[PDB]
């Protein structure tokens, strides 16, 4: 395959990027504490959003509402409107740096993980966490909701990747969170985990150098395969939303795509300099992004020769 970049950012280390469902925009958090808004298309910056003390690595749009939510090594989940450009509110509670922060899709809710062994549900109307997740041994390096039922998956440096029932704080909404599955496999701590948009697939990576692909039904889990090739850590892993691919980066410097079918190796991309530390896909379009030592790079992946 080759990349077809459409927008880079120069900069110093940029930790997350976010892309806004519907605008061509992507949010950038960045080692240096700041909160970058780019318009990828015109490649301009709209805003900067200056909010908190030391490495920003949590950045996440709401899917429909001008809002987006930040995390940072300050421990704190803040809140923000772009189209008024304020810092609504800060969501205190953790303590230790805050390493995700997303949105849920159809309740009133954010979800947040911490290096303090917790993941924290806040509901954003009445600025209440409504659930403390606790269980993990270790620092929780990411936690993401499932796009159509009551789960979140999380992944530790405990080793383990955990599957959480969250149908009873739902019930309340309208017993709150129950670990349902320990994932073991993973021989050391793990740093991504990632559900498919459609498709009963978790995603894990971590320091192992292996990224994990497991199935799901209401009943159980499993583990289909590995992919093998990274030499280093790996930081963030994904699945293309609408090829059978998936998609890893890395501190050995590269991007690799994977078969999502067999696990081979279809492609990898290297930077010469720059460890990356965390790829994201736009939900509807080809438009991939990923955030390493020198800025955010925007790119379409196309098959080779494409072109």
């Given at each position: 395959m080759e990349m077809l970049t459409k927008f880079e950012s120069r900069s110093s280390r940029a930790k997350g990027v976010a892309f806004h469902p519907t605008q061509p925009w992507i949010l950038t958090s960045l080692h240096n504490g700041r909160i970058q808004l780019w318009d990828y298309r015109m490649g301009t910056l709209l805003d900067r959003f200056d909010g908190?003390?030391?490495?920003?690595r949590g950045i996440a749009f709401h899917p429909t509402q001008p809002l987006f939510v930040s995390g940072g090594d300050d421990y704190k989940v803040n809140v923000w409107n772009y189209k008024s450009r304020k810092l609504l509110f800060s969501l205190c509670g953790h303590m230790d740096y805050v390493r995700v922060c997303t949105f849920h899709h159809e309740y009133p809710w954010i979800l947040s993980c911490s290096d303090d062994q917790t993941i924290r549900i806040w509901n954003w109307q009445s600025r209440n966490c409504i659930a403390i997740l606790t269980?993990?041994?270790?620092?929780?390096?990411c936690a993401a909701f499932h796009p159509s039922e009551d789960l979140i998956v999380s992944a530790s440096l405990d080793q383990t990747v955990r599957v959480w029932d969250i149908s009873g704080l739902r019930m309340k909404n309208a017993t709150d969170a129950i670990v349902k599955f320990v994932l073991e496999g993973h021989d050391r701590g793990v740093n991504w985990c990632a559900f498919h948009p459609t498709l009963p697939l978790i995603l894990s990576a971590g320091d192992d150098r292996l990224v994990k692909l497991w199935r799901m039904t209401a009943s159980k889990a499993w583990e289909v395969d590995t992919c093998r090739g990274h030499f280093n850590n790996v930081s963030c892993c994904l699945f293309h939303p609408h090829q059978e691919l998936i998609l890893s980066a890395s501190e050995d410097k590269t991007i690799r795509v994977w078969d999502?079918?067999?696990?081979?190796?279809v492609q990898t991309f290297r930077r010469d300099n720059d460890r990356f530390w965390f790829i994201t896909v736009h939900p509807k379009l080809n438009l991939f992004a990923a955030a390493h030592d020198s800025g955010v790079m925007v790119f379409k992946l196309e098959s080779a020769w494409s072109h």
């Amino acid at each position: 395959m080759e990349m077809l970049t459409k927008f880079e950012s120069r900069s110093s280390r940029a930790k997350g990027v976010a892309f806004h469902p519907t605008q061509p925009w992507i949010l950038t958090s960045l080692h240096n504490g700041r909160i970058q808004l780019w318009d990828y298309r015109m490649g301009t910056l709209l805003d900067r959003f200056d909010g908190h003390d030391g490495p920003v690595r949590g950045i996440a749009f709401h899917p429909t509402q001008p809002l987006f939510v930040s995390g940072g090594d300050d421990y704190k989940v803040n809140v923000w409107n772009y189209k008024s450009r304020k810092l609504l509110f800060s969501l205190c509670g953790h303590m230790d740096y805050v390493r995700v922060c997303t949105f849920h899709h159809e309740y009133p809710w954010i979800l947040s993980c911490s290096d303090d062994q917790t993941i924290r549900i806040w509901n954003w109307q009445s600025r209440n966490c409504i659930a403390i997740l606790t269980g993990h041994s270790h620092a929780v390096m990411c936690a993401a909701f499932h796009p159509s039922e009551d789960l979140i998956v999380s992944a530790s440096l405990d080793q383990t990747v955990r599957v959480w029932d969250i149908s009873g704080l739902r019930m309340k909404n309208a017993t709150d969170a129950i670990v349902k599955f320990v994932l073991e496999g993973h021989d050391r701590g793990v740093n991504w985990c990632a559900f498919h948009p459609t498709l009963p697939l978790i995603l894990s990576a971590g320091d192992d150098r292996l990224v994990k692909l497991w199935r799901m039904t209401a009943s159980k889990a499993w583990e289909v395969d590995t992919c093998r090739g990274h030499f280093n850590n790996v930081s963030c892993c994904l699945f293309h939303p609408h090829q059978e691919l998936i998609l890893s980066a890395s501190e050995d410097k590269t991007i690799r795509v994977w078969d999502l079918n067999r696990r081979t190796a279809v492609q990898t991309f290297r930077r010469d300099n720059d460890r990356f530390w965390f790829i994201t896909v736009h939900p509807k379009l080809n438009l991939f992004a990923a955030a390493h030592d020198s800025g955010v790079m925007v790119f379409k992946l196309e098959s080779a020769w494409s072109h």
